[PDB]
Amino acid sequence: GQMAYDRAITVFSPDGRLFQVEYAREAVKKGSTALGMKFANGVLLISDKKVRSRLIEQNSIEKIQLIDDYVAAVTSGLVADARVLVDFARISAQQEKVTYGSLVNIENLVKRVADQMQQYTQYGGVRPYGVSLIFAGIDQIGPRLFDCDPAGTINEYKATAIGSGKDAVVSFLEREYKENLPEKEAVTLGIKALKSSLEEGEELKAPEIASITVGNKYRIYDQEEVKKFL
Amino acid sequence: GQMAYDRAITVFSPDGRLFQVEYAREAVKKGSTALGMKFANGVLLISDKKVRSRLIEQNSIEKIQLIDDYVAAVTSGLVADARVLVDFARISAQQEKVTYGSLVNIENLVKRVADQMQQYTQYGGVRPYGVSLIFAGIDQIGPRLFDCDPAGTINEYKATAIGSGKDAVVSFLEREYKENLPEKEAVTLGIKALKSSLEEGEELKAPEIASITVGNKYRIYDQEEVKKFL
Amino acid sequence: GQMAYDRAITVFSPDGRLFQVEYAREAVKKGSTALGMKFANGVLLISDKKVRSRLIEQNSIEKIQLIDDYVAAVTSGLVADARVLVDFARISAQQEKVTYGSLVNIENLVKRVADQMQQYTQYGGVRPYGVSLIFAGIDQIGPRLFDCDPAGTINEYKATAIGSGKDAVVSFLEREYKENLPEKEAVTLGIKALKSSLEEGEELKAPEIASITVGNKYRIYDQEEVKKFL
Amino acid sequence: GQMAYDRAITVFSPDGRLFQVEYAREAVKKGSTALGMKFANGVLLISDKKVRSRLIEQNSIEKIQLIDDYVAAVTSGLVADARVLVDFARISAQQEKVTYGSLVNIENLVKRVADQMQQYTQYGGVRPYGVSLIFAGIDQIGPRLFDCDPAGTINEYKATAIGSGKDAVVSFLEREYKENLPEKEAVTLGIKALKSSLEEGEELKAPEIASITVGNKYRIYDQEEVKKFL
Amino acid sequence: GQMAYDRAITVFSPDGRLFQVEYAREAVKKGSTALGMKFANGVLLISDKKVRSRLIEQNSIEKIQLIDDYVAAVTSGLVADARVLVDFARISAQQEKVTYGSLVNIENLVKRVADQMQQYTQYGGVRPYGVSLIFAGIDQIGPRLFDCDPAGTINEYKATAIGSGKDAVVSFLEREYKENLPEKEAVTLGIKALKSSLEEGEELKAPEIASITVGNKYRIYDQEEVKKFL
Amino acid sequence: GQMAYDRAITVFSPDGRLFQVEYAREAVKKGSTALGMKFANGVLLISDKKVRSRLIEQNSIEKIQLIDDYVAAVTSGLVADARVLVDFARISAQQEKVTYGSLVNIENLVKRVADQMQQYTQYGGVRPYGVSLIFAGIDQIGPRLFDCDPAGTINEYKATAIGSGKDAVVSFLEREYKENLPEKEAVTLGIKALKSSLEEGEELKAPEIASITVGNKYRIYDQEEVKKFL
Amino acid sequence: TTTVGITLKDAVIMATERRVTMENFIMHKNGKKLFQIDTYTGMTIAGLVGDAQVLVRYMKAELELYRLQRRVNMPIEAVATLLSNMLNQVKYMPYMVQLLVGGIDTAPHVFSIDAAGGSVEDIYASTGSGSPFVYGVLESQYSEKMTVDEGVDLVIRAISAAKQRDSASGGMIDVAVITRKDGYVQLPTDQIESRIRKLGLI
Amino acid sequence: TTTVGITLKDAVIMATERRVTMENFIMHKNGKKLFQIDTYTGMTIAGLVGDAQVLVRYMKAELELYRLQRRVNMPIEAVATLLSNMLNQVKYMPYMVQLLVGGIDTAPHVFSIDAAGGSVEDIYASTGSGSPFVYGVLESQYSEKMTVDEGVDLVIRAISAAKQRDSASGGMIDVAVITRKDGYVQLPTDQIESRIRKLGLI
Ligand SMILES: C[C@@H](NC(=O)[C@H](Cc1ccc(O)cc1)NC(=O)OCc1ccccc1)C(=O)O
Ligand SMILES: C[C@@H](NC(=O)[C@H](Cc1ccc(O)cc1)NC(=O)OCc1ccccc1)C(=O)O
Ligand SMILES: C[C@@H](NC(=O)[C@H](Cc1ccc(O)cc1)NC(=O)OCc1ccccc1)C(=O)O
Ligand SMILES: C[C@@H](NC(=O)[C@H](Cc1ccc(O)cc1)NC(=O)OCc1ccccc1)C(=O)O
Ligand SMILES: C[C@@H](NC(=O)[C@H](Cc1ccc(O)cc1)NC(=O)OCc1ccccc1)C(=O)O
Ligand SMILES: C[C@@H](NC(=O)[C@H](Cc1ccc(O)cc1)NC(=O)OCc1ccccc1)C(=O)O
């Protein structure tokens, strides 16, 4: 039954489902866990790192990407598709700055990215992007936190997560998250949430941390500062 | 089950896999083994040679190709697709020089090549390139070493390998690689890594060696110098 | 198993094979045997002739075609596709002469032809050319000898062959070929190689012979001269 | 086995065959037999006529068509496709006259027609022409006689035939054809060849005869002259 | 066997047949019978009428259509496709008059219509017209009578028929047709031919009659004149 | 058998049928019954109304649409496709008025609509309109009444009907219709015809009535006048 | 340039001179300005040489294709109409030519066509810089009852007068006669010279 | 610029000078204006150097491809017709050149082609600013019965006269002789100098 309605993107199932979009969401769950949360006059992003062999440079596997000095993004899923979407977001942000002289709402930037992803779910001959993204930054309204799925759906969160351990992290944040926390406390809480999603075999491995506050630009935590919360 | 989701490039499997991309990676493993590693103020490339009949000229089977005087590439997989990608890289490098007057980051050149390969995995009516590439050179940041797969993924390495004996070489380099080695020592280590990947029947056959140092252009090792490490 | 991955050109097999390209190579092996070899300051081409009924004019079945006064080609496989590729090569050669005033490297001409053939193996809605070609001539580097397959692969040889008796001829040349032979000796050796590939029933039938030397243009052997080596 | 590789034009069989092209050749063998032969300073065409009911005008079923005053063609196979190809040949001939002021080689005209037919065997969404053609005329080289098949192959003959009785006619001409015969003798020989291809039930029925000599234009034999050889 | 080669227009059968074209000819045989014949300095058309309910106006079911004042056409098969082809013929006739100032040969007009129909039998994504047409008129050569089939074939007749009772009418005309008959006698003969094609149950029902003579325009027989031959 | 030739619009059945067009006609029979008839110097339209819940406004379910002040149309079948065709007819009518300054023949307007519908039955990638239409109005010839089917066929009637109860209404009109009736009598006859098509369970429910006379514009019957014939 | 075409009872006579003025001097003395474009049709050209030669090649191709498809020669008025459409379609980037078309389909015809595509049938016409001198001779001496021999002498005298007064005209006179019985016949040069000597024009 | 081409019984002789005037002064004294474009065909160029050089490359490519496809050399009149079409197709954005084409197919031919695509065959022709001086020499001294040696001396004298009166012409004279027996042969410079000394032109 299901195998008869899961071969083409533009085919609805008898119960009104799009299995090709659903299958793309399975690719997202294979990616590394990442999360973001808002705090007092700021927002931060944490991305888990799976340490590979020592032959890999520790500068290209960074999943946190700056869209500009005030907007950052983190992705999960197909790396190649994620790189294309990040490049599209950067071009879209600059187009906004050329047209109006500045960027006023981050939600508009997310919508342009999501509209691009939604287009690849309605026309034949293409496949949907197998990537989920989280956008966080500061605009003329304040700290913002958004997520985007392969289907192109947009939601705004006080705290959210993507990746393989998404369910474990969101459950942990459902119990222990507090609003308007200081930046240091928020990072400690985020480390515990990422810690509570791994298996018993492994342990936390000094992830990527980035944050921004109102009136300032994005700053990337160095390895020395990360070890302090480790 | 798998045979129902491995016929079209733009079809996701129920577990979120792209089998056509995976099958392209099988073509890569049929190619000859090649590797590259960085050393003190430089980077080198080694490509194994399978000696065919004496009727073949020993000038066209060279898998190491110069993108410019400061960037070189080596490929593995479908030869015909590899030639097209190398030509695309050379044109892309010259476009960068015309626009800005010079080449500043090699990673940008690799991204343009990878974006071309990623495009052939999302649109119907085309097949992905069955080629993996390694890019090494000197730019305004220093020695660089990149790899690219049929899916269009990009990673940066201190040392890496491609081809049939990729697993054996990377395991050997995982145990014996050292940083900031002199050029002569690095070549000797690379020969042993390539040696430790062949079967008991055959033996090493004077491969291709190329290297470059900061402030200089790429130089190709002649047969006389290769025999000295043989 | 194989029958599920051999219907479309743009489909990889589970073991990373392109069966449609492979099937095109089967059409090549149905053609008449042809070979070429380099000698002292020159290169020659020999193409076997299968004598049909006397009603056929002995001027159109010539498989050796001049690309210009200094480059010649011989083909094997589908005659109709071979004619199209030869016309494409002739146009490409003239485009080179208009742009630069002369032709410097024959290898560049072969690459343009091979790129055309490679394109017909990656896009849907078209089939690959079922033709293999051998290019021989004199350029600013010296005598050159190239071959091209339906997949678009390029190799340079001191001596090579195409067609049905390719395996027998290359084995014979693997044992008896010598470098820098005089033109008369090279033709005699080539006749024996073509002779050693036929079945016991038939015999050699005065084939086509063409050759060129440095500083001169291509000359076509007449029937009188061919009978002297017969 | 064969039924799995005979549905699409752009699909090679495992043994390197194009069955759709082969099937088009079957449509040709359903057409009426026609033949042409060269004689002393001239060339002629003979086309068998199958007499239908008396209600059909005896002016439109003529299979011999003049391309110009010096080139004529005869076709066999699908009538509708044959009409299109004849119109294409006439336009191509006039384009040659506009560009150069005259027509020098008839073989060039045949190649343009054959290239059109070859194109319809390599691209999807179209079917090959089910027509075989014979071109005969006088140019700056002398009497010419060509044939063309659905695959687009070109051959030059002293005498040839197409249609249902092609095998019988070519066998008869293989035994009794002579070169440089007078025009009257050549017509008598051609009538016997066409006669020797019919079944025992029927008999020859006053076919179409056309001929041309050097320095003159094409002339069409009238019914009175045809009865003289009947 | 047949069901494997009758789904696509651009697919040849193993015996060189185009079943989609053949199936279109079946739609033609469902139409009402119509016929035309030439007489002394003229030509006429007769089209059988199947009387439907009295609620239908007796002015739109007329199958005889004037292409201009000197050319008329009658169709059989799919009414909707027939209307499109008649409109195309009318536009084509006016294009001829604009270019040359008059219409010289009716056969040229028929060829343009047939070329349009032939095009819809060689390209995928379209279906052939299921219409057969008969063209009759006066040009600079004299009375003309042509027919056209879905395949685009053209034949010229002294008398012919189309529709369901085509076989019965042509057999009757094969026995009783005479040339250069007066107009009144020709109409009487045509009525008998149409009468001899119906079943025993029904009877002739005052059909459409149109005729034209040299030096005059087309005239449509009124019901009063039709009853005189009834 | 039938299931093998009913999947694509551009496929003929072995007996020369287009099942996709036939299936579109099934959608028409699901619509509400409507009819039109001509009377003395006028023509009227009646469309049955199926009373839904009271929450629906009684102004948008009107199936009678004015093309202009002198032409009206009523449709049956897919509502969404019907709206598109009505909009196309309105644009076509205005194009006629811009080009010539007025509308002379309504039949020309119907042909443009029918040509649009016929086009969607011959090209792949589209589906036919599942709508039947009736056009009635006054032009320079007099009262006109036309119908159009999904196949694009055009017929002119003194009285006709479309919808689910088409067969019952046309049978009733076949027995009781009279020509040149007064407007009041014609409406009473039309109500009885619509009444004689419903089932025993339900009853007539004050339908839509519109009419026009020579020299006047279209007028829509109000509910008060409809109840007088109820 | 001087071209002329006249009609008789059953014949059409066309004639031109041969002088070509390229780069403001007499560069060519034996140019060709009279062409056969069909079995019973001829054409003369005046104006830009490049434009005229292209049109001649186009007309030969169109008329030959027309004959092969419709099995009959194109009527003379249809030839003029085809030329009229071709020239008018590019009227704002036009061919800078003056054309005469003459031939036999069922009766003699001569057509004059301008650069804008205007086509007018006439009993006789003349084009080129020497045309007004020709019209003077034709107005005073042309007769519809003339024989073919008298018509040939008439066009020779008219062109000879033009050469005496128009510096852009000169060279040998080429004459063609078109009849149903004999088709398109170009008179030999020696015959033209004999007529010139007999008329006392040298 | 001064170019000339003449026809003899079985030969074609073409000759040019070498002066190139770039930026209103004599910048180059040894320019090339005579080219071999086929086995038995040559061409001379006058006008804009850039346009002329592009056309020479086009003609070499077209003629070589023609020879390879149809197995024979293109006829001389066909070469002129091809050039005529190419120039006329861009007449409103034209090549600002004057061209001479000469060669042997079955008989000697010389064609003159202008920027608008007009092509006229002639027994002899000359192009460039020095052409009127050449025509004066040819009108008084050319003979159709001349031998090849006499023809070579004739073109040398004609170009020498042009160099004495046209400031845009000068430099060494290049001469080519085309025959069926010997093909395209460019005369050596020393032989030209010997003829100049024998004729007393220095
Ligand atoms: C780095 C990134 N993940 C990754 O490393 C992803 C995980 C993944 C693998 C296979 C899939 O089919 C889907 C997703 N790997 C990935 O994108 O490369 C593997 C790949 C497999 C098939 C087609 C193309 C590429 C993350 O942690 O978000
Ligand atoms: C030189 C290069 N390898 C090679 O020589 C590759 C290896 C290969 C063969 C078949 C495959 O299907 C895939 C890869 N051969 C190759 O590209 O030519 C064989 C070929 C087979 C099928 C389609 C097109 C070409 C290397 O060593 O990297
Ligand atoms: C002259 C040339 N060979 C030939 O004569 C080739 C050999 C061949 C036949 C059938 C095939 O499917 C493939 C190759 N014949 C050929 O090209 O014509 C036969 C043909 C068959 C099917 C489709 C189109 C054409 C040679 O000797 O190289
Ligand atoms: C006049 C011409 N032959 C003919 O009359 C050909 C013979 C033929 C029939 C059916 C086929 O499938 C193929 C060929 N008939 C033909 O072209 O018309 C029949 C036809 C059948 C199917 C599709 C289109 C047309 C000849 O003698 O060459
Ligand atoms: C008036 C005209 N015939 C007719 O009335 C034709 C006969 C026909 C019916 C169904 C078919 O599949 C094919 C032909 N009817 C017709 O064209 O309308 C029925 C139709 C059926 C399926 C698709 C489109 C339209 C005639 O007598 O020639
Ligand atoms: C108002 C109009 N009829 C209607 O209300 C039509 C009747 C119909 C329903 C389903 C069908 O598949 C076809 C026709 N309904 C309708 O167009 O909406 C239902 C629908 C069903 C499937 C696809 C799109 C729309 C009428 O009375 O003419």
Residue numbers in the entry:
A (entry chain E), B (entry chain D), C (entry chain C), D (entry chain B), E (entry chain A), F (entry chain G): 4 to 233
G (entry chain H), H (entry chain I): 1 to 202
Paper text:
Central to this system is the proteasome, a molecular machine that selectively degrades proteins. The architecture of the archaeal 20S proteasome is conserved resembling the eukaryotic 20S, but its α and β rings are homoheptameric rather than heteroheptameric.
To determine the details of how the HbYX motif induces gate-opening in the archaeal 20S proteasome, we used 20S from Thermoplasma acidophilum (T20S) and incubated it with ZYA. This ZYA-T20S structure resolves the N-termini of the α subunits up to Gly4, which include three N-terminal residues that have not been previously resolved. In the ZYA-T20S map, densities corresponding to ZYA bound to the α intersubunit pockets were clearly visible (in blue) and resembled the expected structure of this dipeptide. The carboxybenzyl group (i.e., Hb group) docks in a hydrophobic pocket, interacting with V24, L21, and A154, 3.7 Å, 4.3 Å and 3.6 Å away, respectively. Additionally, we noted the backbone of the dipeptide hydrogen bonding with the backbone of G80, V82, and ZYA’s C-terminal carboxylic group forming a salt bridge with the sidechain of K66, consistent with previous observations on the importance of K66 for HbYX-dependent gate-opening. Interestingly, the ZYA-T20S model shows that T13 is pulled out of the pocket from under Helices 0 and now I12 binds into this same pocket, which is mostly hydrophobic, containing A11, I12, and V14 of the same subunit. Simply put, I12 and T13 switch binding locations under Helix 0 to switch from the closed to the open state.
